[PDB]
Design a protein around this nucleic acid. Sequence first.
RNA 1: GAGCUAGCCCUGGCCAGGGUGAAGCUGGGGUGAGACCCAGUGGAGGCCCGAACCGGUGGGGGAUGCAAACCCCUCGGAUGA
RNA 2: GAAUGCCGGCAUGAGUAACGAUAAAGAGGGUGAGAAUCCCUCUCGCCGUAAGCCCAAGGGUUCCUACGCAAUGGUCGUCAGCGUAGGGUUAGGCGGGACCUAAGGUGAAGCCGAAAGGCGUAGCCGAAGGGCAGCCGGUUAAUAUUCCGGCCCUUCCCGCAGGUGCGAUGGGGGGACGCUCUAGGCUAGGGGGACCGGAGCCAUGGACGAGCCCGGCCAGAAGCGCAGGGUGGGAGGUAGGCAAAUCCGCCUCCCAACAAGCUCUGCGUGGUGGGGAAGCCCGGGUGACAACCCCCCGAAGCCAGGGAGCCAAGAAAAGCCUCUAAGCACAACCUGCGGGAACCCGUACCGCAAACCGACACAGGUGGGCGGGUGCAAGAGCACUCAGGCGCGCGGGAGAACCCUCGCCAAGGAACUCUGCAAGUUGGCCCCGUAACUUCGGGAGAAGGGGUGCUCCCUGGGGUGAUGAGCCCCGGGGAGCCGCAGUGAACAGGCUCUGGCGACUGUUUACCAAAAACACAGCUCUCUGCGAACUCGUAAGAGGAGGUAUAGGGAGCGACGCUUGCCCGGUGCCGGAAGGUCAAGGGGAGGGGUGCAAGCCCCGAACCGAAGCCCCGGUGAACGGCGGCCGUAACUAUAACGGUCCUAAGGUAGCGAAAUUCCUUGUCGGGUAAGUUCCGACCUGCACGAAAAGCGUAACGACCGGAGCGCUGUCUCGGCGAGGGACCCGGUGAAAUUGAACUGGCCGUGAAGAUGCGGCCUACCCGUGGCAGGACGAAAAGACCCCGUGGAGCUUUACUGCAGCC
RNA 3: CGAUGUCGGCUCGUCGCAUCCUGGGGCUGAAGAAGGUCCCAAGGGUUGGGCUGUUCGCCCAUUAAAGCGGCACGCGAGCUG
RNA 4: UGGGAGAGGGUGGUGGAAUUCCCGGAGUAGCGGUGAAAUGCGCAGAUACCGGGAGGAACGCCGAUGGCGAAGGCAGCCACCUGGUCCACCCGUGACGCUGAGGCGCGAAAGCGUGGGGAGCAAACCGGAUUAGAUACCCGGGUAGUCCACGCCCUAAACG
RNA 5: CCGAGGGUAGGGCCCGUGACUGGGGCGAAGUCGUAACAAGGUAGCUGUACCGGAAGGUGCGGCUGGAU
Lengths: 48, 275
Amino acid sequence: MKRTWQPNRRKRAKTHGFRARMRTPGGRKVLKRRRQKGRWRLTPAVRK
Amino acid sequence: AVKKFKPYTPSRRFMTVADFSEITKTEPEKSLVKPLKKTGGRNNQGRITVRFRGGGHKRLYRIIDFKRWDKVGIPAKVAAIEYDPNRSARIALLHYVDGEKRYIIAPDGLQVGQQVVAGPDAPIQVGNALPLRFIPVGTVVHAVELEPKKGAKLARAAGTSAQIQGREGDYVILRLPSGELRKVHGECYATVGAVGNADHKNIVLGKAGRSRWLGRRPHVRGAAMNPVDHPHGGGEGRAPRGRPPASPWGWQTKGLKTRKRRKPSSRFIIARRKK
RNA sequence: GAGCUAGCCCUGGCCAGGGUGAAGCUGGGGUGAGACCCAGUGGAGGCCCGAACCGGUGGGGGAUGCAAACCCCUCGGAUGA
RNA sequence: GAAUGCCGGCAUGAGUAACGAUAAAGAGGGUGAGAAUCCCUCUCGCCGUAAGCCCAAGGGUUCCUACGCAAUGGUCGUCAGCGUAGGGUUAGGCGGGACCUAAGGUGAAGCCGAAAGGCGUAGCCGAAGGGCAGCCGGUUAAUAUUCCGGCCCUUCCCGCAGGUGCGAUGGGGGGACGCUCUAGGCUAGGGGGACCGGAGCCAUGGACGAGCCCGGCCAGAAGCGCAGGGUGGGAGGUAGGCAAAUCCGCCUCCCAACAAGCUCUGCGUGGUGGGGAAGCCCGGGUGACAACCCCCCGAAGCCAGGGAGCCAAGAAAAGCCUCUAAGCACAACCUGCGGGAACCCGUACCGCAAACCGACACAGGUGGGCGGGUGCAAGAGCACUCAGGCGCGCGGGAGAACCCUCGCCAAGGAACUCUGCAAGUUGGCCCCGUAACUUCGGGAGAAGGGGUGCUCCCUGGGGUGAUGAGCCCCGGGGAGCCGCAGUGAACAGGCUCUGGCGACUGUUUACCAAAAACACAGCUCUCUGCGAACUCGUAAGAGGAGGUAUAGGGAGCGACGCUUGCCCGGUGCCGGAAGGUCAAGGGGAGGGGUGCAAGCCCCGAACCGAAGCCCCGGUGAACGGCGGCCGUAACUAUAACGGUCCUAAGGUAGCGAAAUUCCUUGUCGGGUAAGUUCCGACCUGCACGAAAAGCGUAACGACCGGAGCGCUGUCUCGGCGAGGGACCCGGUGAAAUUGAACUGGCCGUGAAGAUGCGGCCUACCCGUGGCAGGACGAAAAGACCCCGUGGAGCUUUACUGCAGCC
RNA sequence: CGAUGUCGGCUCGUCGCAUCCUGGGGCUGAAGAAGGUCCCAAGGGUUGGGCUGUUCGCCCAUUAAAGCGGCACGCGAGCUG
RNA sequence: UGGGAGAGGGUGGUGGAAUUCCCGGAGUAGCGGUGAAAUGCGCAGAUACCGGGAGGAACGCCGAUGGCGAAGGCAGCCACCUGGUCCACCCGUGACGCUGAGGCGCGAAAGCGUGGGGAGCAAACCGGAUUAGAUACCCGGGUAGUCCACGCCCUAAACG
RNA sequence: CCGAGGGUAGGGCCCGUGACUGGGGCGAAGUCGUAACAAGGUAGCUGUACCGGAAGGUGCGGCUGGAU
Ligand SMILES: [Mg+2]
Ligand SMILES: [Mg+2]
Ligand SMILES: [Mg+2]
Ligand SMILES: [Mg+2]
Ligand SMILES: [Mg+2]
Ligand SMILES: [Mg+2]
Ligand SMILES: [Mg+2]
Ligand SMILES: [Mg+2]
Ligand SMILES: [Mg+2]
Ligand SMILES: [Mg+2]
Ligand SMILES: [Mg+2]
Ligand SMILES: [Mg+2]
Ligand SMILES: [Mg+2]
Ligand SMILES: [Mg+2]
Ligand SMILES: [Mg+2]
Ligand SMILES: [Mg+2]
Ligand SMILES: [Mg+2]
Ligand SMILES: [Mg+2]
Ligand SMILES: [Mg+2]
Ligand SMILES: [Mg+2]
Ligand SMILES: [Mg+2]
Ligand SMILES: [Mg+2]
Ligand SMILES: [Mg+2]
Ligand SMILES: [Mg+2]
Ligand SMILES: [Mg+2]
Ligand SMILES: [Mg+2]
Ligand SMILES: [Mg+2]
Ligand SMILES: [Mg+2]
Ligand SMILES: [Mg+2]
Ligand SMILES: [Mg+2]
Ligand SMILES: [Mg+2]
Ligand SMILES: [Mg+2]
Ligand SMILES: [Mg+2]
Ligand SMILES: [Mg+2]
Ligand SMILES: [Mg+2]
Ligand SMILES: [Mg+2]
Ligand SMILES: [Mg+2]
Ligand SMILES: [Mg+2]
Ligand SMILES: [Mg+2]
Ligand SMILES: [Mg+2]
Ligand SMILES: [Mg+2]
Ligand SMILES: [Mg+2]
Ligand SMILES: [Mg+2]
Ligand SMILES: [Mg+2]
Ligand SMILES: [Mg+2]
Ligand SMILES: [Mg+2]
Ligand SMILES: [Mg+2]
Ligand SMILES: [Mg+2]
Ligand SMILES: [Mg+2]
Ligand SMILES: [Mg+2]
Ligand SMILES: [Mg+2]
Ligand SMILES: [Mg+2]
Ligand SMILES: [Mg+2]
Ligand SMILES: [Mg+2]
Ligand SMILES: [Mg+2]
Ligand SMILES: [Mg+2]
Ligand SMILES: [Mg+2]
Ligand SMILES: [Mg+2]
Ligand SMILES: [Mg+2]
Ligand SMILES: [Mg+2]
Ligand SMILES: [Mg+2]
Ligand SMILES: [Mg+2]
Ligand SMILES: [Mg+2]
Ligand SMILES: [Mg+2]
Ligand SMILES: [Mg+2]
Ligand SMILES: [Mg+2]
Ligand SMILES: [Mg+2]
Ligand SMILES: [Mg+2]
Ligand SMILES: [Mg+2]
Ligand SMILES: [Mg+2]
Ligand SMILES: [Mg+2]
Ligand SMILES: [Mg+2]
Ligand SMILES: [Mg+2]
Ligand SMILES: [Mg+2]
Ligand SMILES: [Mg+2]
Ligand SMILES: [Mg+2]
Ligand SMILES: [Mg+2]
Ligand SMILES: [Mg+2]
Ligand SMILES: [Mg+2]
Ligand SMILES: [Mg+2]
Ligand SMILES: [Mg+2]
Ligand SMILES: [Mg+2]
Ligand SMILES: [Mg+2]
Ligand SMILES: [Mg+2]
Ligand SMILES: [Mg+2]
Ligand SMILES: [Mg+2]
Ligand SMILES: [Mg+2]
Ligand SMILES: [Mg+2]
Ligand SMILES: [Mg+2]
Ligand SMILES: [Mg+2]
Ligand SMILES: [Mg+2]
Ligand SMILES: [Mg+2]
Ligand SMILES: [Mg+2]
Ligand SMILES: [Mg+2]
Ligand SMILES: [Mg+2]
Ligand SMILES: [Mg+2]
Ligand SMILES: [Mg+2]
Ligand SMILES: [Mg+2]
Ligand SMILES: [Mg+2]
Ligand SMILES: [Mg+2]
Ligand SMILES: [Mg+2]
Ligand SMILES: [Mg+2]
Ligand SMILES: [Mg+2]
Ligand SMILES: [Mg+2]
Ligand SMILES: [Mg+2]
Ligand SMILES: [Mg+2]
Ligand SMILES: [Mg+2]
Ligand SMILES: [Mg+2]
Ligand SMILES: [Mg+2]
Ligand SMILES: [Mg+2]
Ligand SMILES: [Mg+2]
Ligand SMILES: [Mg+2]
Ligand SMILES: [Mg+2]
Ligand SMILES: [Mg+2]
Ligand SMILES: [Mg+2]
Ligand SMILES: [Mg+2]
Ligand SMILES: [Mg+2]
Ligand SMILES: [Mg+2]
Ligand SMILES: [Mg+2]
Ligand SMILES: [Mg+2]
Ligand SMILES: [Mg+2]
Ligand SMILES: [Mg+2]
Ligand SMILES: [Mg+2]
Ligand SMILES: [Mg+2]
Ligand SMILES: [Mg+2]
Ligand SMILES: [Mg+2]
Ligand SMILES: [Mg+2]
Ligand SMILES: [Mg+2]
Ligand SMILES: [Mg+2]
Ligand SMILES: [Mg+2]
Ligand SMILES: [Mg+2]
Ligand SMILES: [Mg+2]
Ligand SMILES: [Mg+2]
Ligand SMILES: [Mg+2]
Ligand SMILES: [Mg+2]
Ligand SMILES: [Mg+2]
Ligand SMILES: [Mg+2]
Ligand SMILES: [Mg+2]
Ligand SMILES: [Mg+2]
Ligand SMILES: [Mg+2]
Ligand SMILES: [Mg+2]
Ligand SMILES: [Mg+2]
Ligand SMILES: [Mg+2]
Ligand SMILES: [Mg+2]
Ligand SMILES: [Mg+2]
Ligand SMILES: [Mg+2]
Ligand SMILES: [Mg+2]
Ligand SMILES: [Mg+2]
Ligand SMILES: [Mg+2]
Ligand SMILES: [Mg+2]
Ligand SMILES: [Mg+2]
Ligand SMILES: [Mg+2]
Ligand SMILES: [Mg+2]
Ligand SMILES: [Mg+2]
Ligand SMILES: [Mg+2]
Ligand SMILES: [Mg+2]
Ligand SMILES: [Mg+2]
Ligand SMILES: [Mg+2]
Ligand SMILES: [Mg+2]
Ligand SMILES: [Mg+2]
Ligand SMILES: [Mg+2]
Ligand SMILES: [Mg+2]
Ligand SMILES: [Mg+2]
Ligand SMILES: [Mg+2]
Ligand SMILES: [Mg+2]
Ligand SMILES: [Mg+2]
Ligand SMILES: [Mg+2]
Ligand SMILES: [Mg+2]
Ligand SMILES: [Mg+2]
Ligand SMILES: [Mg+2]
Ligand SMILES: [Mg+2]
Ligand SMILES: [Mg+2]
Ligand SMILES: [Mg+2]
Ligand SMILES: [Mg+2]
Ligand SMILES: [Mg+2]
Ligand SMILES: [Mg+2]
Ligand SMILES: [Mg+2]
Ligand SMILES: [Mg+2]
Ligand SMILES: [Mg+2]
Ligand SMILES: [Mg+2]
Ligand SMILES: [Mg+2]
Ligand SMILES: [Mg+2]
Ligand SMILES: [Mg+2]
Ligand SMILES: [Mg+2]
Ligand SMILES: [Mg+2]
Ligand SMILES: [Mg+2]
Ligand SMILES: [Mg+2]
Ligand SMILES: [Mg+2]
Ligand SMILES: [Mg+2]
Ligand SMILES: [Mg+2]
Ligand SMILES: [Mg+2]
Ligand SMILES: [Mg+2]
Ligand SMILES: [Mg+2]
Ligand SMILES: [Mg+2]
Ligand SMILES: [Mg+2]
Ligand SMILES: [Mg+2]
Ligand SMILES: [Mg+2]
Ligand SMILES: [Mg+2]
Ligand SMILES: [Mg+2]
Ligand SMILES: [Mg+2]
Ligand SMILES: [Mg+2]
Ligand SMILES: [Mg+2]
Ligand SMILES: [Mg+2]
Ligand SMILES: [Mg+2]
Ligand SMILES: [Mg+2]
Ligand SMILES: [Mg+2]
Ligand SMILES: [Mg+2]
Ligand SMILES: [Mg+2]
Ligand SMILES: [Mg+2]
Ligand SMILES: [Mg+2]
Ligand SMILES: [Mg+2]
Ligand SMILES: [Mg+2]
Ligand SMILES: [Mg+2]
Ligand SMILES: [Mg+2]
Ligand SMILES: [Mg+2]
Ligand SMILES: [Mg+2]
Ligand SMILES: [Mg+2]
Ligand SMILES: [Mg+2]
Ligand SMILES: [Mg+2]
Ligand SMILES: [Mg+2]
Ligand SMILES: [Mg+2]
Ligand SMILES: [Mg+2]
Ligand SMILES: [Mg+2]
Ligand SMILES: [Mg+2]
Ligand SMILES: [Mg+2]
Ligand SMILES: [Mg+2]
Ligand SMILES: [Mg+2]
Ligand SMILES: [Mg+2]
Ligand SMILES: [Mg+2]
Ligand SMILES: [Mg+2]
Ligand SMILES: [Mg+2]
Ligand SMILES: [Mg+2]
Ligand SMILES: [Mg+2]
Ligand SMILES: [Mg+2]
Ligand SMILES: [Mg+2]
Ligand SMILES: [Mg+2]
Ligand SMILES: [Mg+2]
Ligand SMILES: [Mg+2]
Ligand SMILES: [Mg+2]
Ligand SMILES: [Mg+2]
Ligand SMILES: [Mg+2]
Ligand SMILES: [Mg+2]
Ligand SMILES: [Mg+2]
Ligand SMILES: [Mg+2]
Ligand SMILES: [Mg+2]
Ligand SMILES: [Mg+2]
Ligand SMILES: [Mg+2]
Ligand SMILES: [Mg+2]
Ligand SMILES: [Mg+2]
Ligand SMILES: [Mg+2]
Ligand SMILES: [Mg+2]
Ligand SMILES: [Mg+2]
Ligand SMILES: [Mg+2]
Ligand SMILES: [Mg+2]
Ligand SMILES: [Mg+2]
Ligand SMILES: [Mg+2]
Ligand SMILES: [Mg+2]
Ligand SMILES: [Mg+2]
Ligand SMILES: [Mg+2]
Ligand SMILES: [Mg+2]
Ligand SMILES: [Mg+2]
Ligand SMILES: [Mg+2]
Ligand SMILES: [Mg+2]
Ligand SMILES: [Mg+2]
Ligand SMILES: [Mg+2]
């Protein structure tokens, strides 16, 4: 049956992307915390 | 004259349709339509603020001239009477000798090929618009402005009208469609005659689908819900209201008056509606 | 977090085939004129039968599954909310 | 040493279950250390509205070639979507961008908010919508509308010639639209040909034939032909299209008009360029100088912005055309031609799946297009089959129980059972025929029955031609033939009578409930005069609605028919300028502290002072409510009638042992041999009753009752048979569970149900297939119950606040 | 209560005997035949339907008879539901 | 052919009196009602009086024992459209007539459907009286309806 | 071939009968009131509608077959 993950590159970039995170106060805190933890990827990798 | 169907489906047994007899043109004037932005009852926050709305037939907005004092003295020929999906009245295409074309809402008895005109000098004839102070007492009017130059607000739905009852200073007294008696400024414009399509009220939709075409989504009773949802929610089995019948938001809904008490327009309202 | 799900908004797409035969129209009858009757034409409908498609009624299987909802048989809708 | 402790390791179950669709395999040859599993050949089977082909998502080298087999692959492996390496993706015309706008997002101006931020007309962004110029064939191991070949085309720049008042982000036109049905002419695709081309074949009894088998086209500028789309022309007036305008709009006159004309598209033809089968030889050569024609069927595609009907009345903006403004008019623009210029990104491969979503090479999920032939009435249904693709990554045997899926059955025929659950029966088409009742539509495929193949003869009409033959379509009549049986296989209703509930089609607890529940047209109450009421938000701002009482919000009821009684004392709501009560504030009689003092400071009576509450009315499709006792009539029984207590007032019509009835299987009637169910009645209704509607109602229902006919392995009552497992051998090899175990019966005992204690009995050691009585067997720190001054959802005339409103 | 699945049915039994039948008896208000009552006796047997979820019970048609109880109100790692 | 009378019919307009309600004024202790009363209304200012407004229905006098129509039935006034009928002339047609089963149309009131309207009245209903009682007669309230449009119903002491 | 009839299925009409139910006629020796006949104590009757233990009442319109 139809499962929950229905990948869509535009949806992924527009929802979790770098520019979405930089728009809001909450999103910038995400990047700050991910940079502070040392994450190799700050935002989900999506092709485009 | 409303038209019936033979009962060849269960819904056609009672379904009725307007006869569309006054209609002489089946396409709108291209320069006078614009897209009507559908809301689904949602506001600029994306929240539903009017329940049970959406899914109706696509419609274009016909631009209606609700001023007419725009063009005092300039007569116009009634070129056509057309269907308007955005209102219960029909609409009338006017060809001004100016060359400008405009829509008004179609009065009762309006005739294609007759002329109409607006202004303090206009004859007292169906379709003409004049300031209230120049229309004689007893005349029934429609498309009445409530304040000078703010546009027609009153008596615009199919079959409705207001009647001039008297004069008092700068103001005239009208009996509004609701039966309310109200002072309206004499410089407010009105159109003589009642709004047409008076058989509108006698239409029987006939089936649930017909409400859906109109963008009316099903309305679910408070008594059909749960206590999280509605004052009338819950109870084992059916339940009577068990309290004063209330809205989803808790306020009472049988009799409780809701007009704001200290409203400035109260000085201009003579008698509240009676029925 | 609405890439699942619910509602709405914008813009596209899909619905084999068969059946029933509303209004209207035309002709004939009828009448003072009519209503109306018959025939033909017509092609309406949350109309009918039935695939795609959407479902999930009853039973059987499965039950450390093929599957954290599946399989078989049967069954509902299928121009419409 | 224990915490169902934590991490790791390793056991048991066990060589056990299983190895993932029951579409299916066999042999020969090759390779190799090794072969059921890799390659090749032949035979067999499966799909073929796919299990084939194309595209979009998503995936991201999985593509091609060489080398390789540790692991991955449910076995094997020499193979591979795996390991290593090398190679592979070519565009002005395909898709996106240097174009347009949609919802929506963002956002000059502007508005709002403690901060963060929230809005916001224009503008901008935003596509699978609009717009825009490439078709056929060849080539690679692997790309091709991209390379090549042929024939076409677009934009930009510059130049030449001719033409014109040129010129725009401004004005106007246009772009530009629904649903259903549909005409004409075509194309795609398909069938046939005694005609054209072709390698060959004559078998096994016959056939050298109008034999069999194979193929008989594709693209193509200008021109031309056919079919369609679009569009009236001239002049005069002009105050409207936020400037201007010769444009457009409006008025008037002339002419033209279902014509033509101009224009545009489709189709055909067309210089030219291609393709080209079976068979046979080793993807390639040959066939071949291949032929490339006629007839029929024919779209849902094209002409298209076609036509008609209907109501629910069906985007925008740019490209384009036209108008003019600044300007500029040696410019500029238009047309023709010529030369030059033409960027960025994608392009492999999988793509109904072993490469996407499901932890797996997972029987599940995944949008668009093509989807041949024959027959069955039609069809994308069903059977078979083409092209093409597969046999589903463990096999080999055996022929037990039992399980699954399947076939048949004597006599009986629902006797089964909670229930005909399940399975039979029926089954398509044509003809005949068809009841109560009904809202006149229906009920209806009611029911029930007849026909159905093939052969010969005669004949009717239509389509295509030409009017004829041919082809194709729809018929009619007569005479025959065969079988148990002619929708001969596959696909394809069992029916009827009668209740309850819901009017109806719809909707729902994704994943235990599809219903009588929700919704629904329709009915009623009520609010709302527009900066509406109401909703969301602190606000600005939004929805309502670019709507205006025939409208919008809230509530109940729920098609329709006939109806909807009595009670306003309590609660609610509505009305009430009196009166009572009423906070801040006003007022300041009188009193107090302190100071020598003027003075400062404090308390404080009358009186004035809102909503609210009290009070007076109204109001039921507002919350709700709608009695009891005694007596009485020619026999009894009962009580129309009287009396009395109470109440705000005492239940009307209709219905009633009911989806409501306790006593209850009430009583009577019906049906049955027999009826706690069912149907019809009665009425002492424990405890119906009128919009939480009452009583009915045609039609409808995968709803829940009761009955009959038909038919059956449901049953008496079981038997046989088939395949997939179970079983045996080779390969691979889990699991929950497990204090340790050397783990029998009885009668007792024991914390009250003992393999484990006592007595007695019985018992050689160890497995394999089976069955489930026990191990108070497993699983889940009981889906009940209580306890905890544990938690959470919900309610209200519990308490206390808050928003909101007054 | 870190779970002992709970009515009825089906299937499969096995046991007790306070015996329904069949076998053996005594008493009788036992003429016979048929009964009544008690005693011995558990070897075997103890039907098919209608109603209802029913256990039970009532009813139909039979029968030699249509027994009553226990086994976690026997039996859901056996089925039903 | 020429005249006549008439509440004959249909449509659209339109006038005044009176009732009720609302507004402004003025005023106060009752009003109303009956056989007599009470309920009701009224100091929250009623009744009575004046001015203004709104709205529905019916048309005083004329009016008669009158007129018209087939019957039902028709009454302010104006206009339009339209029926029947009488008289005079004795001009035209030349028995073209009478009746009329069926059919068709009309048909008071009440009632019904959809939608308006709603002042007065008033079934049902509530209350006060009366009375032995009083589901009545009388009184105070009061919803259908009475009125308009369209469609039904088709009855009557539809009687002379 | 037709064919008595038999079988299957579905309709139409008539008769008898039925738990129960509706009113009617008669009986008369009862209970309740007194609706009509007199102005019958509210003139009567009437079509229709709504209502009431019952006769009946009321509304709307009609008749006189109404006393004074
Ligand atoms: Mg998706
Ligand atoms: Mg995407
Ligand atoms: Mg996308
Ligand atoms: Mg997206
Ligand atoms: Mg982003
Ligand atoms: Mg990481
Ligand atoms: Mg790094
Ligand atoms: Mg992130
Ligand atoms: Mg009709
Ligand atoms: Mg109808
Ligand atoms: Mg019709
Ligand atoms: Mg119906
Ligand atoms: Mg119509
Ligand atoms: Mg109209
Ligand atoms: Mg009309
Ligand atoms: Mg249109
Ligand atoms: Mg426009
Ligand atoms: Mg708009
Ligand atoms: Mg809008
Ligand atoms: Mg927005
Ligand atoms: Mg937002
Ligand atoms: Mg709302
Ligand atoms: Mg909504
Ligand atoms: Mg709509
Ligand atoms: Mg309209
Ligand atoms: Mg003023
Ligand atoms: Mg209308
Ligand atoms: Mg409506
Ligand atoms: Mg509604
Ligand atoms: Mg609802
Ligand atoms: Mg609920
Ligand atoms: Mg919630
Ligand atoms: Mg709450
Ligand atoms: Mg609540
Ligand atoms: Mg409640
Ligand atoms: Mg309740
Ligand atoms: Mg409830
Ligand atoms: Mg209840
Ligand atoms: Mg409930
Ligand atoms: Mg409920
Ligand atoms: Mg309910
Ligand atoms: Mg109920
Ligand atoms: Mg209630
Ligand atoms: Mg309740
Ligand atoms: Mg309550
Ligand atoms: Mg409020
Ligand atoms: Mg105002
Ligand atoms: Mg669209
Ligand atoms: Mg369809
Ligand atoms: Mg027809
Ligand atoms: Mg027509
Ligand atoms: Mg249908
Ligand atoms: Mg349908
Ligand atoms: Mg199912
Ligand atoms: Mg079944
Ligand atoms: Mg089965
Ligand atoms: Mg099962
Ligand atoms: Mg499981
Ligand atoms: Mg499961
Ligand atoms: Mg399945
Ligand atoms: Mg299936
Ligand atoms: Mg089916
Ligand atoms: Mg169907
Ligand atoms: Mg269909
Ligand atoms: Mg249809
Ligand atoms: Mg449908
Ligand atoms: Mg639709
Ligand atoms: Mg320890
Ligand atoms: Mg453990
Ligand atoms: Mg453990
Ligand atoms: Mg542990
Ligand atoms: Mg651990
Ligand atoms: Mg192990
Ligand atoms: Mg073994
Ligand atoms: Mg084992
Ligand atoms: Mg497995
Ligand atoms: Mg398996
Ligand atoms: Mg091998
Ligand atoms: Mg090997
Ligand atoms: Mg091979
Ligand atoms: Mg991946
Ligand atoms: Mg490749
Ligand atoms: Mg590779
Ligand atoms: Mg390997
Ligand atoms: Mg290996
Ligand atoms: Mg190896
Ligand atoms: Mg492996
Ligand atoms: Mg391996
Ligand atoms: Mg595997
Ligand atoms: Mg090797
Ligand atoms: Mg592989
Ligand atoms: Mg290479
Ligand atoms: Mg190119
Ligand atoms: Mg550029
Ligand atoms: Mg843009
Ligand atoms: Mg863009
Ligand atoms: Mg695009
Ligand atoms: Mg392109
Ligand atoms: Mg081309
Ligand atoms: Mg390549
Ligand atoms: Mg448009
Ligand atoms: Mg479009
Ligand atoms: Mg449609
Ligand atoms: Mg072609
Ligand atoms: Mg063909
Ligand atoms: Mg031979
Ligand atoms: Mg031939
Ligand atoms: Mg042609
Ligand atoms: Mg001008
Ligand atoms: Mg062409
Ligand atoms: Mg070739
Ligand atoms: Mg089609
Ligand atoms: Mg409409
Ligand atoms: Mg726009
Ligand atoms: Mg200049
Ligand atoms: Mg030019
Ligand atoms: Mg560039
Ligand atoms: Mg490529
Ligand atoms: Mg699939
Ligand atoms: Mg596909
Ligand atoms: Mg594939
Ligand atoms: Mg994979
Ligand atoms: Mg596999
Ligand atoms: Mg798969
Ligand atoms: Mg094909
Ligand atoms: Mg067939
Ligand atoms: Mg067929
Ligand atoms: Mg099928
Ligand atoms: Mg074939
Ligand atoms: Mg296989
Ligand atoms: Mg396999
Ligand atoms: Mg064996
Ligand atoms: Mg199978
Ligand atoms: Mg048998
Ligand atoms: Mg039988
Ligand atoms: Mg039988
Ligand atoms: Mg049954
Ligand atoms: Mg069949
Ligand atoms: Mg019948
Ligand atoms: Mg009928
Ligand atoms: Mg029907
Ligand atoms: Mg039949
Ligand atoms: Mg039937
Ligand atoms: Mg044959
Ligand atoms: Mg088949
Ligand atoms: Mg069927
Ligand atoms: Mg029936
Ligand atoms: Mg019912
Ligand atoms: Mg239903
Ligand atoms: Mg329901
Ligand atoms: Mg109903
Ligand atoms: Mg309903
Ligand atoms: Mg329904
Ligand atoms: Mg449907
Ligand atoms: Mg659930
Ligand atoms: Mg569920
Ligand atoms: Mg889920
Ligand atoms: Mg669930
Ligand atoms: Mg769940
Ligand atoms: Mg289920
Ligand atoms: Mg469910
Ligand atoms: Mg529901
Ligand atoms: Mg419902
Ligand atoms: Mg109703
Ligand atoms: Mg709020
Ligand atoms: Mg705003
Ligand atoms: Mg708006
Ligand atoms: Mg708005
Ligand atoms: Mg509105
Ligand atoms: Mg009826
Ligand atoms: Mg009563
Ligand atoms: Mg009350
Ligand atoms: Mg009250
Ligand atoms: Mg009272
Ligand atoms: Mg209360
Ligand atoms: Mg109040
Ligand atoms: Mg006073
Ligand atoms: Mg003092
Ligand atoms: Mg002192
Ligand atoms: Mg106060
Ligand atoms: Mg009411
Ligand atoms: Mg109460
Ligand atoms: Mg209530
Ligand atoms: Mg007595
Ligand atoms: Mg009863
Ligand atoms: Mg009973
Ligand atoms: Mg009942
Ligand atoms: Mg009850
Ligand atoms: Mg009880
Ligand atoms: Mg009972
Ligand atoms: Mg009981
Ligand atoms: Mg009984
Ligand atoms: Mg039963
Ligand atoms: Mg009783
Ligand atoms: Mg309720
Ligand atoms: Mg009922
Ligand atoms: Mg249903
Ligand atoms: Mg159902
Ligand atoms: Mg069997
Ligand atoms: Mg067999
Ligand atoms: Mg077998
Ligand atoms: Mg076998
Ligand atoms: Mg040991
Ligand atoms: Mg024990
Ligand atoms: Mg023990
Ligand atoms: Mg023991
Ligand atoms: Mg032992
Ligand atoms: Mg020991
Ligand atoms: Mg011991
Ligand atoms: Mg021992
Ligand atoms: Mg022993
Ligand atoms: Mg065991
Ligand atoms: Mg077992
Ligand atoms: Mg044990
Ligand atoms: Mg146990
Ligand atoms: Mg637990
Ligand atoms: Mg725990
Ligand atoms: Mg516990
Ligand atoms: Mg517990
Ligand atoms: Mg639970
Ligand atoms: Mg407890
Ligand atoms: Mg406590
Ligand atoms: Mg709590
Ligand atoms: Mg326990
Ligand atoms: Mg445990
Ligand atoms: Mg346990
Ligand atoms: Mg015995
Ligand atoms: Mg004897
Ligand atoms: Mg003895
Ligand atoms: Mg024995
Ligand atoms: Mg024994
Ligand atoms: Mg029983
Ligand atoms: Mg019993
Ligand atoms: Mg009994
Ligand atoms: Mg016997
Ligand atoms: Mg015996
Ligand atoms: Mg026992
Ligand atoms: Mg017990
Ligand atoms: Mg017990
Ligand atoms: Mg037990
Ligand atoms: Mg048991
Ligand atoms: Mg079980
Ligand atoms: Mg059990
Ligand atoms: Mg167990
Ligand atoms: Mg067991
Ligand atoms: Mg008079
Ligand atoms: Mg003469
Ligand atoms: Mg009448
Ligand atoms: Mg009347
Ligand atoms: Mg009436
Ligand atoms: Mg009395
Ligand atoms: Mg009234
Ligand atoms: Mg009434
Ligand atoms: Mg009424
Ligand atoms: Mg008379
Ligand atoms: Mg016969
Ligand atoms: Mg015979
Ligand atoms: Mg009387
Ligand atoms: Mg009397
Ligand atoms: Mg009298
Ligand atoms: Mg009565
Ligand atoms: Mg009484
Ligand atoms: Mg009365
Ligand atoms: Mg009369
Ligand atoms: Mg007399």
